[PDB]
Structure formats: C-alpha cells, structure tokens
Design a protein around this nucleic acid. Structure first.
Ligand SMILES: [Zn+2]
Lengths: 124, 125, 242, 107, 95
RNA sequence: ACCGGCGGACGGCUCAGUAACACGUCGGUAACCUACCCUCGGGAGGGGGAUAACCCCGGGAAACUGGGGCUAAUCCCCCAUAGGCCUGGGGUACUGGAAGGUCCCCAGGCCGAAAGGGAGCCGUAAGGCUCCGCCCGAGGAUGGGCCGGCGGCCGAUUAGGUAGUUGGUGGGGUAACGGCCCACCAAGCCGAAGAUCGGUACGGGCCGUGAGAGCGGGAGCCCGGAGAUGGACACUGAGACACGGGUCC
C-alpha cells in the first residue's frame, strides 16, 4: 500500500507530494474524511518540505482521494466499499448539461488499502 | 408513474390494445394525505407548463368562517367524520369534505388542502 | 412522433390567401405570432420581395428591413416574419408610398394605394370588451390590439363597432357604430371584398353566430356573418375601399 | 330563465349541481331529439335516435340507430318511451356526455 | 449588335438602377460581358466602376438575347449589397 | 478557451404496431397549458454567496476524475412592495345564447419579481438622445391537450361478452373534465342492425381501370398518427418520459 499523499497549504495555495510505503500507512488506514491527524504522527517534516516555519500544532485534514483504478472517493458514501451510484453533481461527476444524471463508480469516505492517492489540507 | 390516460376496456366489455407509449402529460402524482399535526408542512411542486402548486402534508391551523365572513385562525384538534373515505376519519386525514372540530366548535372543510395548501372551513350551526 | 411546436412551413401547405408560387421552392416563411390570424396575414418578407419587388433575395429584403426603411401601422418593423394583416397601413417614407392591406374578391390579400392624409388612420373592429383590475374597460380589437377607457365611457363602445385610431400615437378619432344603414366591408367568406349598407340582423339559439344582410350599391341583397361585417363608415365609406 | 333553448323550463325545483336549469352545468354544442330506451341506471337514460342512411351503389336507404347516454336531472324525471331533448355538455362520466333539457312528449 | 433598353427602374431603398435590355444580333457569337458592359455604359452614361451585369441570357433559336444589369450610386453600397460571386464573375474584384 | 443565454422536442428517415375518437368532416372546451411574437396599463428598492477560466499538486491503460487558493456576470440566494391562488360575507359594472367567468367592497390564510444589465453619440461634470434589454397584470397570436355526432374491411366450421364492468354519492390527482384512481352504494352496460373473439391493414387528399354504374390499390408528393434493437422508467425544460441525451432487464 504505497500512498502518494498530497499536502495542500490553504494559506499559500501550494501543494506537495509525499510517497509513503508502509508502517505509517496503517495509522492512516481506517480513517474517515473529516478527521484530523497530527503531522508529527506521520513522520512528515512539512516545515522543511515547504521551506517554511510551520508551527508545532500543525494537523493533517484528509479531504478525499482516489484508487488504483482512478475512481474517486465520495465523502458521502459510507464504508470502505466500491459502489455504482447515479450521480447528478458533486465529487465523481461533472454534469456538462443542465440536469442530466449519469451512473459512475466511486468509493466510500473511509480509507482502504486500495487507495493510492490521499489529498490533505494543512490546518494550523 | 400514476397514469391517468384512457381505459383499456370499451363500454361494451371489449379489450383495447395500446397503440402508443405512455405520454408525460398523462401522468398524475401521489395522493397528499394531509395529517393533523403541531406545525404546518408544505412543499412546492412544478407542474405542467412551469406552473406551480402548493401541497400541504401536515395541517395545524384552519381558517374558519361563520355566516358573516368573519374568519378566524383556529388550531385543528381532530377529525370527526370524512365521507370521502371510511378510514380517513380514524386516520385523522383532512379532506375537502371532512368535518373537524376546533377551539370554537365544529366546522366543515370547503377547500382542497392538496391543491392550494390551505385549510378553510365553515362553522356548523 | 410529435413532441413540440412546429418551426417550418411547406409551400404547398401555406395559406391560400398569399400571392405565392407554391411549386417554385419547398419552404415558406412561417409567420411569427402577432396581430392577425394565420389566414389573414402574410410575412413582411413577401410584401418586401414579391408584392413590391424592392429586393430580389431574402438577404436583401432582410437588410432593407433591418435598415428601418419599412413602417407598418406607423411603427418600424425589422423582423422579416412579422405578420401583416387586413386594414393595415404600410408606409415607405423614402419613396413616399402608402398602401392599405385588403382582401381581394377571391380571398387573396392585396395592397391598395392610399393618400398620405389617410395613411394616419387605422380602422379597428372591437372584437371584445371586458373589465380589468380597477374600474377600467378594456377593448380588444380584431388585430389583437388593446385599448383602455374609463367606466364613464362604457356605453360609448360595443362589440362589432369600429374605432378610427391615429397611428402611431394611438389616439381615438371617431367611433362608428354597428346599426342599420351603417356602411360595412366584408373581410372574409364567399362575399369577401363586397361592400354595402346594413339592412337586418338575425340571431339564433345556442352558439350559432349572428347573420347580417347587406345591400350593395346596385341594390343586390346578400348575407354574411356579423363578425365578418366590418363597419367602415356611417353613410359613405370614410376609407377608400375599391 | 333561459339557457339558450327555446323550450319551457321544468315546473318544479331541484338541487342537482349538474342540472343546466337549476345548477352550474353549462350546455354547448349539438342538440338532439330522441326516445328514451333505457332508464335503469341512477340519474341516467339511454336515448335512441333513428335515421336513414343512403347507400349510393344500391340507390337505397337503410335504417340506423344512434344510442346516447345522457344525465337525467331530478327535476326532469324521464322514463322509458318518452320523447326528450338532449344537449351536449362536458364529460360527466365515461359514457355520459349529454344532458336532458326537456321532455318533448311523455309516453 | 444593337442594344434596346426595354425597361429602366430606379430602386431608392437600394440606391441602384435596374436596367432590362435586349441585344439584337444576326448570326454571331453571344456578346461578351465586357463588351456588353462597355456599350451599355457608353450609351447610358453610367459609372464604369459601379455597374454589374446580373446576366446575359440567350434563348433557343433566337437572335435576341435578354440582359439584366444594375448600376449603383455608391461603390461601398455596391460592395455591401451585391454578393461576392457576381462581382467576381463581372471582374470587379481580383479574387 | 471557459462560465452564461437561446436552440438542440423543428427538420430528416420508416409503416413495425394499431379495427382505435388512429383518420376524414362538422361542432364544443363556459373543463384546459403555451418559451419565442404583438397591444395596452404598471415596476425595476436594499443586501448577500459561491464557482468556472487561471495557479499548485495529481490519480487513472483508457473512459473519466480528486484536493487546495483567487476571482465576475443578464450566475445563484435573501429582504421589501407590487402581483398569484383558496375560502367566507355583500353590489351588480362587463362579455356572452346562457356565468362555478370577469369587476368592486370587507374578512382569514398561503405562496411571492426583476437585469436600468449592455452598446453607441454628445455633454467639463451633472445630465441628455438613441439601439438592443429585464419583471408583473389583461388580452391576443402560435403549437397543442381533451371531448362529442356522423363515415369508411372479411370470418357465425367464432353466440354469447363484461365485473371497475355500467351508473351514482364523497373525495384524490391532473394543466384540464372524466372510473383516470380511491371509499361506499346499486345492477347495471354490449349483442344476430353481428357483441366478444380471430385474420388482415398506418387513415385521408388520391392513384389504376371501365362509356358509365362499378372493381381494385392506397410506398414515393401534402396533412394527421405511431417508432428509433424488443420492453420498462425517470432528470432538465414552455414543450420529451427525448433517433445523433439519461437508468435497468
Ligand atoms: Zn333541475
């Protein structure tokens, strides 16, 4: 389970990539979108990564991600399962028409070993 | 959906075969069972041609008039009788023909809650 | 297979009131909704191109119309699909020309030259009369136009009466009543394009229309519908109708 | 009162909302004369009208029947065999689209 | 080759003059557009750079060929009104 | 290039299905809806919020698609007044052949608008002129929905068919009236003048033939109806349950 986690700084609009192979992936696994995790708990030296003087209380907010198959994660579907849902808007669908609905494949909010990329927002 | 097109039996007792698919303009909506509650609940429905309807699902107040045009807003307590259905009286469902009793006595409904979203009634002498 | 409104009109299916070649091409302009009916109307494109021959192509006709060179009822009309109906005044100030649209003896629409002084008058038959919010009376004319008056003047107007309106100012000039001896002009039917004086009016039960008998100049008596009888005078026509 | 027909109204009064004489029902369209053949259904009568149809090829006529179901207002209590007048109205039921307006003659 | 002006009309909404003419000629080739325009301009005193020959049409077994032309008041108006193809055919634009 | 508006429901193709108010004709809707367009009478007041594009970082073999920041509108939301609907009591002002219609006065309630936005020419500014615009009300106009009378094949080696079936009362739903649906009350309704069932078929204007009566066909053009591999469903829109849109077998 090699994650390609993305860290985005809301105060600068800049994002960086960090690839994590094991050990630290277990703590991330099982979490749900909307949960905060201290940066130190992931052995991330984001201060030197971003060349900043980030405080010591920085916390990692997970907002979503994707899979090996490229199907995104809907923060609304419960459980670490892949489902087909008829979507009109929101994550996983781009309407392109006034009111159309198309069926797409998505995954639940909970993180699973199948996840390959996890997006994270820095919370000071 | 709730089709409201032609019947499939002739008046002579014969059988009719559909010559076309169901059309959108011929479709109805689910019945609105206005129930007495502690707070009014209404919804907006977009109808044919872009027009609009106000559907009342829960009714709390009623506008009661007594022989002189003097209207009062009085809370609904219970439904006494409803000739429309034999079970509506027991299920406490308001209907255009229902008879209710409010703080100022018995009244008979004269409006259609499912079509205009208002409960109007006349006091019974 | 039909799901909504039509946008096209085949030439063979065009109204019989148009002086159009029904076999030269396939399509014809579909009139936009407007003042008069489909049968008593013709798109301004045909007036500009065929009737008058001021343009040889629809592109030229559209350019001239957009240049605001044509006035109908005293107002400049730019769209080439505008309906033009009976008792309408078409004005070309640049050439100083003025025409009145009238039915023919065979039901086709024609342009009758008129005088400049007369070009400012439009007759309008009161198709209906009702009351609107407030205490005002609304009059609906044969071309779909509307006018508003006060409750005091309610008795000054009635159905089938004629009103002479000054265009484009939209001002009342005179009211011609519908009564015995009133000069009338037939707008449609078998007796279209005939004129005379009212002689008798007959009513019938249910929704059957009224029937009116008209005496022509030569003395012949004919019949038509009251709605088809258009009042255009009292003793002698106030509008040239030959 | 008159409802567009040159016929005398019924003598007595009724409270049927679907009575053109004493109700909100409006009559418009065709008017027919017929003979009542059935009156069993409640407030309904079947009116039969006979007419001749011309067969071109044989240059001969043939009798034909026209059965119509019409609403029977309480004031106009039509029976079997009566000659009645009916007028077209809005759809009142699956088959009833006419209303009896008067009884031309009673059997 | 003799040109007879059957009709001349003044269009004022479109600032032009419409000329209908007939070219009578005994057995000879159908007259060319350049020759027709030159003769018409010389005869009717028109502006050479503002006349466009709509057509010169010959008929079956006839010595009279009909012709329709237009003479504008303004070069800009001519360019704005006339389609490109007719002007190219008459050789008013180099293409 | 993107947001945003309109259109994409017309046109084009086929005759499968359908013996039916599908089609032809005459009438009705006083029982109903309609963007575009026309006329008249009115209005445009105060606030608020996202996000596309773009930038950083991607994921996915593709098809597609995630996270973070920064923005505008004729984008979206809220408040205010006009306006819309229901009901009760009074006067009769209007059209109609006839008012459950329209108008006026009180009463109880629900719902509830806009874009003074854009362009040009002047004007020191202010302000002005013009062009295309936005919202509400009453009418039209355009395209339809629904209903009625009459008319147009063969089989009796098919004689009985019908049970929401026929009608009623009270309601629901619809844009609209209606057993269209629902709850109860009755036994009604169709039929040898051929019901029911079965065979065949898109209907008409028309065409082929004959001296005519008549017989036969009704693909090409026009009008109307259905279908988009066979079925069944819904979203957006004035209009579709939609040939080059959507969901399931
Ligand atoms: Zn009665």
């Amino acid at each position: 389970a090699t994650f390609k986690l993305v860290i985005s700084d809301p105060k600068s609009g800049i994002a960086k990539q960090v690839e994590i192979t094991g050990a630290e992936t277990e703590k991330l696994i099982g979490k749900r979108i909307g949960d905060q995790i201290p940066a130190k708990e992931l052995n991330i030296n984001l201060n030197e990564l971003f060349g900043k003087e980030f405080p010591e209380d920085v916390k990692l907010e997970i907002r979503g991600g994707t899979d090996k198959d490229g199907f995104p994660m809907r923060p609304d579907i419960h459980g670490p399962r892949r489902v087909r849902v008829l979507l009109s808007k929101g994550p996983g669908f781009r309407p392109k028409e006034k009111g159309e609905r198309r069926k797409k494949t998505v995954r639940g909010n909970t993180i699973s070993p199948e996840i390959v990329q996890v997006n994270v927002k820095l919370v000071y | 959906a709730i089709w409201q097109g032609r019947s499939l039996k002739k008046p002579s007792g014969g059988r009719i075969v559909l010559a076309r698919k169901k059309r959108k303009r011929e479709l109805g909506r689910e019945p609105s069972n206005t129930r007495v509650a502690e707070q009014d609940k209404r919804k907006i429905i977009r109808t044919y041609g872009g027009n609009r309807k106000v559907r009342l699902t829960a009714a709390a107040y009623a506008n009661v008039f007594d022989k002189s045009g003097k209207g009062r807003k009085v809370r609904i307590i219970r439904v006494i009788e409803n000739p429309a259905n034999r079970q509506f009286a027991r299920r406490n469902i308001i209907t255009k023909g229902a008879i209710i009793e409010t703080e100022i006595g018995k009244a008979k409904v004269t409006s259609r809650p499912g079509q205009d979203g208002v409960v109007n009634a006349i006091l019974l002498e | 297979a039909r799901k909504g409104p039509k946008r096209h009109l085949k030439r063979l299916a065009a109204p019989t009131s148009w002086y159009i070649e029904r076999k030269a091409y396939k399509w014809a302009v579909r009139p936009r909704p407007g003042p008069h009916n489909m049968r008593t109307s013709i798109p301004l494109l045909y007036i500009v191109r065929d009737y008058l021959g001021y343009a040889k192509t629809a592109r030229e006709a559209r350019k001239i119309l957009n240049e605001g060179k044509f006035l109908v009822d005293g107002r400049v009309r730019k769209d080439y699909k505008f309906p033009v109906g009976i008792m309408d005044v078409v004005s070309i100030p640049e050439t100083g020309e003025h025409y009145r649209v009238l039915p023919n003896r065979i039901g086709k629409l024609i342009l009758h030259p008129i005088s400049e002084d007369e070009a400012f008058i439009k007759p309008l038959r009161i198709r209906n009369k009702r009351m609107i919010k407030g205490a005002r009376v609304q009059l609906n004319f044969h071309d779909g136009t509307n006018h508003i008056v006060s409750i005091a003047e309610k008795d000054n107007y009635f159905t089938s009466y004629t009103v002479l309106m000054k265009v484009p100012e939209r001002e009342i000039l005179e009211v011609l009543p519908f009564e015995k001896g009133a000069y009338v002009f037939v707008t449609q039917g078998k007796n279209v394009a005939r004129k005379g004086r009212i002689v008798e009016i007959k009513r019938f039960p249910m929704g059957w229309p009224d029937v009116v008998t008209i005496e022509d100049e030569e003395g012949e008596l004919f019949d038509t519908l009251k709605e088809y009888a258009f009042v255009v005078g009292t003793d002698k026509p106030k509008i040239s109708l030959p | 009162r008159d409802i567009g027909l040159r016929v005398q109204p019924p003598a007595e009064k009724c409270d049927d909302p679907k009575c053109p004489w004493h109700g909100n029902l409006k009559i418009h369209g065709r008017v027919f004369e017929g003979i009542v053949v059935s009156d069993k259904p409640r407030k309904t009568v079947t009116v039969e009208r006979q007419y001749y149809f011309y067969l071109n090829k044989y240059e001969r006529y043939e009798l034909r029947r026209s059965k119509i179901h019409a609403h029977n207002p309480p004031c106009i209590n039509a029976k079997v065999g009566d000659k009645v007048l009916i007028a077209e109205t809005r759809p009142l039921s699956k088959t009833k689209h006419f209303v009896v307006v008067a009884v031309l003659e009673r059997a | 080759m003799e040109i007879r002006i059957k009709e001349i009309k003044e269009n004022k909404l479109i600032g032009r003059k419409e000329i209908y003419f007939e070219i009578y000629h005994p057995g000879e080739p159908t007259p060319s557009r350049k020759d027709v325009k030159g003769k018409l301009v010389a005869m009717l005193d028109l502006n050479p750079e503002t006349t466009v020959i709509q057509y010169i049409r010959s008929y079956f077994g006839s010595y009279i060929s009909k012709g329709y032309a237009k003479a504008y008041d303004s070069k800009e108006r001519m360019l704005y009104i006339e389609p490109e193809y007719i002007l190219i055919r008459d050789g008013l634009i180099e293409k």
